Amino acid sequence: KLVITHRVHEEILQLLAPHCELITNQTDSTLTREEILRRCRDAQAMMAFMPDRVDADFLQACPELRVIGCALKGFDNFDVDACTARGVWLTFVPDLLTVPTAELAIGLAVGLGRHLRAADAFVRSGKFRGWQPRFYGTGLDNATVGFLGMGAIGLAMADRLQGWGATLQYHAAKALDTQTEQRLGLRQVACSELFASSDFILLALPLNADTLHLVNAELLALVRPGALLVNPCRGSVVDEAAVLAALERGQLGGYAADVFEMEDWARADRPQQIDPALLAHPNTLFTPHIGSAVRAVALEIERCAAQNILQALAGERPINAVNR
Amino acid sequence: LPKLVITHRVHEEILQLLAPHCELITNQTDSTLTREEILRRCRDAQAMMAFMPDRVDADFLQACPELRVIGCALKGFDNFDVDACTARGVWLTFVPDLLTVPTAELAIGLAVGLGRHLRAADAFVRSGKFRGWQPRFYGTGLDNATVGFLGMGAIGLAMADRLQGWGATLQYHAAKALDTQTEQRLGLRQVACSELFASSDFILLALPLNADTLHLVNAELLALVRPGALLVNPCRGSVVDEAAVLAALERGQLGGYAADVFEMEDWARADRPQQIDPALLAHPNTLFTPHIGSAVRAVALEIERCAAQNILQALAGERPINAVNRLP
Numbered sequence A: 001k002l003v004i005t006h007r008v009h010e011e012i013l014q015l016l017a018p019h020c021e022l023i024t025n026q027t028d029s030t031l032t033r034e035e036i037l038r039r040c041r042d043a044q045a046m047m048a049f050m051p052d053r054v055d056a057d058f059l060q061a062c063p064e065l066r067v068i069g070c071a072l073k074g075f076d077n078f079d080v081d082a083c084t085a086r087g088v089w090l091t092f093v094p095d096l097l098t099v100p101t102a103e104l105a106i107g108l109a110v111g112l113g114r115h116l117r118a119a120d121a122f123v124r125s126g127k128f129r130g131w132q133p134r135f136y137g138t139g140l141d142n143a144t145v146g147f148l149g150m151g152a153i154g155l156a157m158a159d160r161l162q163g164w165g166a167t168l169q170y171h172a173a174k175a176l177d178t179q180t181e182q183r184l185g186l187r188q189v190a191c192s193e194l195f196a197s198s199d200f201i202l203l204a205l206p207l208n209a210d211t212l213h214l215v216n217a218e219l220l221a222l223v224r225p226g227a228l229l230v231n232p233c234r235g236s237v238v239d240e241a242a243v244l245a246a247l248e249r250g251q252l253g254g255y256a257a258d259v260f261e262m263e264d265w266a267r268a269d270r271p272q273q274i275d276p277a278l279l280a281h282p283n284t285l286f287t288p289h290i291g292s293a294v295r296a297v298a299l300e301i302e303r304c305a306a307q308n309i310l311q312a313l314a315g316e317r318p319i320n321a322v323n324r
Numbered sequence B: 001l002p003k004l005v006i007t008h009r010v011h012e013e014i015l016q017l018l019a020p021h022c023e024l025i026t027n028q029t030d031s032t033l034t035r036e037e038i039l040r041r042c043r044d045a046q047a048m049m050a051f052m053p054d055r056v057d058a059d060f061l062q063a064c065p066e067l068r069v070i071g072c073a074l075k076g077f078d079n080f081d082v083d084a085c086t087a088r089g090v091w092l093t094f095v096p097d098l099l100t101v102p103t104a105e106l107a108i109g110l111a112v113g114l115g116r117h118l119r120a121a122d123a124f125v126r127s128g129k130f131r132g133w134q135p136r137f138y139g140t141g142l143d144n145a146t147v148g149f150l151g152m153g154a155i156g157l158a159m160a161d162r163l164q165g166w167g168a169t170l171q172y173h174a175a176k177a178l179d180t181q182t183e184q185r186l187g188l189r190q191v192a193c194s195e196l197f198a199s200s201d202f203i204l205l206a207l208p209l210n211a212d213t214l215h216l217v218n219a220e221l222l223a224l225v226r227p228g229a230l231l232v233n234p235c236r237g238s239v240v241d242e243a244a245v246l247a248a249l250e251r252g253q254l255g256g257y258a259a260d261v262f263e264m265e266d267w268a269r270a271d272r273p274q275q276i277d278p279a280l281l282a283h284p285n286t287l288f289t290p291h292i293g294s295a296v297r298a299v300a301l302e303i304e305r306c307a308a309q310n311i312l313q314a315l316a317g318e319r320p321i322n323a324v325n326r327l328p
């Protein structure tokens, strides 16, 4: 018995069908936590998506569970240790999400830098009347781009920015080997230096206890006036309220984000919404967690999660297991 | 001192560079100068510094017999009758490189923004109705896509430079082939025009407006595109037939149109439309910018400088470094 909480490609149902009894959700809807939990009561397997939160109380109510196959990279809403305590494999997708998310993050950098939203609303209002000196903005040429985090998305973005004439630097918990540093023209800097010397700041790190509200009032206070911040990872890696305050005083030049604190279900004090004053600020650009919203990629993400689930159900160690 | 007419506001530093050599008739106030007013200022001028709003035809030159050089603060001189300039011994100069990169940057941004439904995505978040991830808002990435470039000069190349590592298959069609070193370097393959339009997931324009390129992207070429193909125009409005573009959008064949430029601003075109069609402005599968390709302020100051230096070379009797025409 396998529960799939959200819609997947028919080809994926067909790969699963001969090994598993499928309890599926082929709608564009997200079901309530209580319905998902009802479906998983006697389930051996769960295919889990971004809206899902799995904790000890969840696992306790589902004693037959052998594997959670997550169709995602950041498992921050899944209690890994609780999974391991109850003999449950926790599985993720380590690479397939990286490229479309990195593409979006560059696009958001450029869009934020060039006042794309405002520019577009201006043409659409039928007020455009040929060239004027207006909407002057920030490009990547001769700029300094700093990466917080240098794993999959950091590296993919660094690859993609090779021809953009920018100076690249990064801060991470784990250093790149210096060979890769030379080849990508990356300089490793301290976090303070990162925030003080970067015209663009691209966040590329997971959400965990140590990264929660890491990007706070203190780090923001170090930024060059007009610096641009882009968040393609997890909302709670920044203090959205400190981001707002930084924008209102004019020090932060722009915040663009694909992700929001309000999505981070594992948090007891999770905000119920994005602050209306952040939505209203002109120096912003937002997308609704579409980092990997390419259909062709979704198929492969679904397939990878499916493969992991079938491996676990066959007694094997899943290739992308997150626990041991 | 030779008299120099500047049609638009310029940075103070540029006044200081020019005032020692020329009498300046400036427009630092940016007040709307009518053709008739510009002619009045230029009637006994030895030089004009021209910008994107300027249009110079044979009748204009005729009325300005002292002119020796028109210094253009721009790349695309489609609005300046070069041949008429040459025949009257007036240098015409432009700015070959300073506009390239920021325009290339904008256009990749527009490609990604168009591909990923940025406008609608942002509206949804800003609406207050975001509830977290959903299996919707699906888009088109660059990885595994075929990107076709029409034109392969300064901007075409800056764009190709910027797409290295993006996992895309790169192809192009131009009036002149790229050298093989550069095709090898950038992974670019040369193909016919029609082939480019039939096999590209992204089509990125990178060509000037002239009599051969006018309305080149017409109903005929658009009828070849893969359904869902995305078209990006950072060049001139009129290399495209916006009406044929709109119909291709409404039909559902063309997946999207993004533009930094519009037919309505191509002033030398007697028959240009008076506006961008409201139905195109209202179409969901679009993304627009108001001719801000070069709008990075570090860059505008240098654009003005370049045009100013060229004027000065011309006035000193030199052949100006960035002359477009060639004089006997």
Ligand SMILES: NC(=O)c1ccc[n+]([C@@H]2O[C@H](COP(=O)([O-])OP(=O)(O)OC[C@H]3O[C@@H](n4cnc5c(N)ncnc54)[C@H](O)[C@@H]3O)[C@@H](O)[C@H]2O)c1
Pocket: A073, A074, A075, A094, A097, A098, A101, A148, A149, A150, A151, A152, A153, A154, A171, A172, A173, A174, A204, A205, A206, A207, A210, A211, A232, A233, A234, A258, A259, A289, A290, A291, A292
């Ligand atoms: N918006 C989306 O659609 C989307 C898609 C995929 C991933 N993500 C999120 O992005 C995060 C990162 O993605 P990835 O694939 O690059 O992950 P990754 O694990 O490959 O890279 C993480 C990087 O962050 C660094 N890091 C960890 N703790 C840090 C700290 N305290 N300070 C500074 N750096 C630290 C690591 O050293 C590593 O360099 C994921 O955890 C996920 O939550 C979002």
Ligand SMILES: NC(=O)c1ccc[n+]([C@@H]2O[C@H](COP(=O)([O-])OP(=O)(O)OC[C@H]3O[C@@H](n4cnc5c(N)ncnc54)[C@H](O)[C@@H]3O)[C@@H](O)[C@H]2O)c1
Pocket: B075, B076, B077, B096, B099, B100, B103, B150, B151, B152, B153, B154, B155, B156, B173, B174, B175, B176, B206, B207, B208, B209, B212, B213, B234, B235, B236, B260, B261, B291, B292, B293, B294
């Ligand atoms: N949006 C902006 O702010 C902005 C900024 C700079 C330039 N531009 C416009 O972009 C245009 C292109 O700029 P560039 O710097 O790349 O010019 P360029 O002269 O360096 O390159 C033009 C390219 O177009 C090709 N071409 C010419 N006629 C063609 C045809 N009939 N079919 C196919 N290809 C043809 C040429 O072979 C050349 O490769 C300029 O003429 C200008 O109008 C716009």
